[PDB]
DNA sequence: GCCTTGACCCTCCCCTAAGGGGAGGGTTTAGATTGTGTGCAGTCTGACGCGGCG
């Protein structure tokens, strides 16, 4: 939601709101076995010990 | 067996001729090295 | 007790949030322009960094 | 101060650049006034050379019969229609014709300044103004190296006092009566000197053409060239004061171009070049700030350099703009359609044919390093998986030598005439093959007999008597 | 080469303008084709097998 | 057989009329903006040499 406040206002009261659903990226999905199919090969993202 | 570009084909046609003798030259990678040191502003040469 | 298992859903969130700051520096750069009345939020979001 | 603590060239540039305080709205006006003061000073100095304004007048005489237009010679007038310029060139013409007939010398030395300050009214274009200044530059530079070789015509004879030699050379300049007192000195040096007094003649008198060619003498236009240098070096150190004070504008613009294939300093150097253009082309009399114009020029220089030198295999600016347009259209379609646009529908969002977009997509990829680690192994690089595809396999080299031997056998199984016709008709054992006429001229025979020879020899070689050694070289 | 030119002017078996770039079974591999998948770029006409 | 000889014949390069289409290059853009920021890496230890430095 892009909120546009006003120019002269004690709060910057809302001049406008533009609310819409923007697509950002595709996130890979863990299959039901704990793998990811990334470029057709099955990959496991290994836990790190840091 | 490896780098000699003119020696590897002579060795091939020598084996096929039944003459197991080599005519070895300079490895090509040594020439690559000489050209990669001369591009460093260092004149490396071969003294006849 | 001093080493910690950081796992798939945490590394993936770290990378997603890196992508989010990449896009939000650009949307801060775009929000301070003067075309501000006629643009929708999906015109200033770049899905490709994220 | 902080000198010696860093080696980073960008830290050094920023540190050295920040020592110049910015300019205010009225600072830029003062600096631009100084620049234009320098250029009108060099104008009013070169107006002392009258062949300059005669050239400009005959340029207007070219504009009389449409050899040019008025916008090519004059950009304005300070104290655009052809209405005023007619009486303007009348003003300069009337001053020139009244200055011509006067020869005197204090009488003829105010008329020239009147000429210069009537000529100041002309806001010349850079073309003509550059032409006149480099013309008078090359004129006095050739006669000036002539004066310098007149001096070093003594160094081949002797080593000499010049502080005694400068008091003599100036002012006579039509004769050797200044050179006649050199033998009145008669120290050993001025012996040798006089024996070259003949080969100095053709030098020392030939500037005597210019002594009447410009109408002036060489010491007057000497001071004119000195004030020329004063004026142009005044304008040059004023443009430098406006370039150095806007070097942060370049950085504020160039930070917006950072990761597009050029280093940061490459971008700000190209922006600096564009800013120097912007300073050269700025008019403060428009009442605009310097930032508004300089931004245009800095943006131009920076994006032009990104188009030129950010890619290994360079694509032109038209293809750079087509790729940029395609990428913008594609990131709009991706936001709308929620997926990557296929080149077919990308061909209807744009208005280009679809194979043009497919080849545009094939262009844009950047070359991979031949040292990229494969799988990030960092013990196996991309470059050691790339084979040399121009070599011929030693089986094919052995086959070619075996085929040469077989051809030698088969061609020795023919007569000398047919073997010669075949060895010249193809390039066998030769550096070239020949036409029927060349082989026939080798044998003082017309071409059709050579064709018949070569045909019958091919017929013989086709037989089962000679062709079982050769047919084995054609893979079935 | 000049000799290959003579060899083909003798027997007349001309050179081919296409080069065999076939996919072959690697040496020593011996098996059964169990699946074939054909992916055609949109715009290329499909052969009988696709 | 060894030659010639005029008649055919092939490929290939360039040409037609009046522009179309594109590639690849130049040029100016005048409200006013005036110091790079990764939400970086930094995380390797031991030996040796050299140079400011007390």
Swiss-Prot record, chain B:
Superkingdom of origin organism: Bacteria
Protein purpose: DNA-dependent RNA polymerase catalyzes the transcription of DNA into RNA using the four ribonucleoside triphosphates as substrates.
Quaternary structure note: The RNAP catalytic core consists of 2 alpha, 1 beta, 1 beta' and 1 omega subunit. When a sigma factor is associated with the core the holoenzyme is formed, which can initiate transcription.
Protein family: Belongs to the RNA polymerase beta chain family.
Protein name: DNA-directed RNA polymerase subunit beta
Record gene name: rpoB
Portion of the parent chain present: 1294 to 1341 of 1342
UniProtKB/Swiss-Prot annotation, chain C:
Superkingdom assignment: Bacteria
Physiological role: DNA-dependent RNA polymerase catalyzes the transcription of DNA into RNA using the four ribonucleoside triphosphates as substrates.
Binding partners and assembly: The RNAP catalytic core consists of 2 alpha, 1 beta, 1 beta' and 1 omega subunit. When a sigma factor is associated with the core the holoenzyme is formed, which can initiate transcription.
Record-stated family: Belongs to the RNA polymerase beta chain family.
Protein name as it appears in the record: DNA-directed RNA polymerase subunit beta
Organism: Escherichia coli O45:K1 (strain S88 / ExPEC)
Parent-record interval covered: 449 to 498 of 1342
UniProtKB/Swiss-Prot annotation, chain D:
This protein's encoding gene: rpoD
GO MF assignments: DNA binding; sigma factor activity
Name the record gives this protein: RNA polymerase sigma factor RpoD
Keyword Lipid biosynthesis: no
Site (Interaction with anti-sigma factors): 425
The organism of origin for this protein: Escherichia coli (strain K12)
Residue ranges of the region described as Interaction with anti-sigma factors: 447-462
Biological role stated in the UniProt entry: Sigma factors are initiation factors that promote the attachment of RNA polymerase to specific initiation sites and are then released. This sigma factor is the primary sigma factor during exponential growth. Preferentially transcribes genes associated with fast growth, such as ribosomal operons, other protein-synthesis related genes, rRNA- and tRNA-encoding genes and prfB.
One GO CC term on file: sigma factor antagonist complex
Annotated region of DNA binding: 436-455
Gene3D superfamilies: RNA Polymerase Primary Sigma Factor (1.10.601.10), Sigma-70 factor, region 1.1 (1.10.220.120), Winged helix-like DNA-binding domain superfamily/Winged helix DNA-binding domain (1.10.10.10)
Region of interest (Sigma-70 factor domain-4), ranges: 410-463
Residue ranges crossing the lipid bilayer per the database entry: none
Domain notes for this protein: Contains 4 domains, connected by flexible linkers. In the active conformation, the domains are in an extended conformation, each making extensive interactions with the RNA polymerase catalytic core.
Localization terms from the record: Cytoplasm
Region called Sigma-70 factor domain-2, residue ranges: 242-312
Oligomer and partners: Interacts transiently with the RNA polymerase catalytic core formed by RpoA, RpoB, RpoC and RpoZ (2 alpha, 1 beta, 1 beta' and 1 omega subunit) to form the RNA polymerase holoenzyme that can initiate transcription. Identified in a complex containing RpoD, the RNA polymerase subunits RpoA, RpoB and RpoZ, CRP and DNA. Interacts with Rsd; this prevents interaction with the RNA polymerase catalytic core and with promoter DNA, and as a consequence, promotes transcription from promoters that require alternative sigma factors.
PANTHER family: RNA POLYMERASE SIGMA FACTOR RPO (PTHR30603), RNA POLYMERASE SIGMA FACTOR RPOD (PTHR30603:SF60)
